[PDB]
Design a protein around this nucleic acid. Structure first.
Lengths: 176, 141, 38
RNA sequence: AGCCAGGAUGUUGGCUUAGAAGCAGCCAUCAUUUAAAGAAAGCGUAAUAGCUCACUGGUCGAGUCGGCCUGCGCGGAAGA
């Protein structure tokens, strides 16, 4: 274990409510973002924050380095937003988005539709980009993972739903 | 050289009658066709140095034009004839036995004197020592 | 590929990680080299 | 280890060969400059390149890398 031994700094102009039940945060890029308490407790008696085990819960010290990550992302989600990575590639396949309800045309008779969770916004700014906005880095990752449930792109043509992060490439006339 | 054009290399074996590099696709990308350079060009090297194999490199110009230029004959070519035996000890990747004295190095150090003019021979006997242990040769230090 | 209990070393181009208890191996450049359990 | 920023000058090296700019072999593997560096590590090309790196700087930060030795665990694990 390494990362729970070290601090994180509160950015200027960010506003927290952090001394009791329900942690609430706001900043430049997000307003009334809140989360319920769990097995990790944060110290706020300096302009740097540190994590440790919350009393009344179990095994929270093994979770303190994980709480730090979710808290850092909970600041990012109210100060600048997250990195866009979802794409749909190949001619004849394209996304549709209402704002609000999103649908993929990817060569199936399945619905391939998503009504979106609360507080999530969806955009499709090009023929191949998809974007998800919110303050929970996991919800904008998991809504993208429901959108990545059909049409997996192959090492012969590379056509379907993909991330800007891959373990496969296309190979033509390969060895053999 | 701080600026270099890096023209295609044309090394082929001695006495070879049907070479493959002077028709290869690298001359195709350099943009030239070679007509006379690899079958009787031993006379065109003997016309610039005798009893000593000299290296030759291409220089290319506009209108598919080319000129051939000489290099320094490497010290290895002199070492392979220093002891009055064929190729010295012969091939690399071989058991070492043939030893070169500082008197033999000081015989080939004379190749530097036209550029190393300061009249110190012991210095030129060390400035010729660069990779002198190549070709499986043994060196006196 | 095969189901395997040996991972060893076989190709220097492999990238190895332990995932959901098992060792996973994928190879970018050298052909057919892959493992899903180990 | 990570993140960002650096990947040359001597060098168009010499030997063998089928050719080979590190880029399958052999000689070696240093000197120089700096904010900074392998005649080369790997994929790769007809070869460079493309690069992803080796190696330093800044940063952060105190232990850590490969083996040897000695113990305990994991996956190895289908049948009525």
């Amino acid at each position: 274990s390494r990362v729970a031994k070290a601090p994180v700094v509160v950015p200027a102009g960010v506003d927290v409510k952090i001394n009791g039940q329900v942690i609430t945060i706001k900043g430049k890029n997000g307003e009334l973002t809140r989360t319920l308490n769990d097995a990790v407790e944060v110290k706020h008696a300096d302009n740097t924050l540190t994590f440790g085990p919350r009393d009344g819960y179990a095994d929270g010290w093994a979770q303190a380095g994980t709480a730090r990550a979710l808290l850092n992302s909970m600041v990012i989600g109210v100060t600048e937003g997250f990195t866009k990575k979802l794409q749909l590639v190949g001619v004849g396949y394209r996304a549709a988005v209402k704002g609000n309800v999103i649908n993929l045309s990817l060569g199936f008779s399945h619905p391939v539709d998503h009504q979106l969770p609360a507080g999530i916004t969806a955009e499709c700014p090009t023929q191949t980009e998809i974007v998800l906005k919110g303050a929970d880095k996991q919800v904008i990752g998991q809504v993208a993972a429901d959108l990545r449930a059909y049409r997996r792109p192959e090492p012969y043509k590379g056509k379907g739903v993909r991330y800007a992060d891959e373990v496969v490439r296309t190979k033509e006339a390969k060895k053999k | 050289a701080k600026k270099v054009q890096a023209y295609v290399k044309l090394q082929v074996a001695a006495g070879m009658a049907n070479p493959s590099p002077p028709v290869g696709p690298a001359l195709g990308q350099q943009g030239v066709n070679i007509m006379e350079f690899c079958k009787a060009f031993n006379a065109k090297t003997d016309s610039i140095e005798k009893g000593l194999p000299i290296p030759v490199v291409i220089t290319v110009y506009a209108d598919r034009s080319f000129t051939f230029v000489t290099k320094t004959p490497p010290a290895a070519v002199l070492l392979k004839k220093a002891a009055g035996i064929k190729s010295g000890s012969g091939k690399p990747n071989k058991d070492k036995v043939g030893k070169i004295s500082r008197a033999q190095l000081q015989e080939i150090a004379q190749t530097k004197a036209a550029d190393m003019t300061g009249a110190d021979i012991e210095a030129m006997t060390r400035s010729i020592e660069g990779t002198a242990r190549s070709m499986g040769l043994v060196v006196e230090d | 590929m095969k189901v395997r209990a040996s991972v060893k070393k076989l190709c220097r181009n492999c990238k190895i990680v332990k995932r959901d208890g098992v060792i996973r191996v994928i190879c970018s450049a050298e052909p057919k080299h892959k493992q899903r359990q180990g």
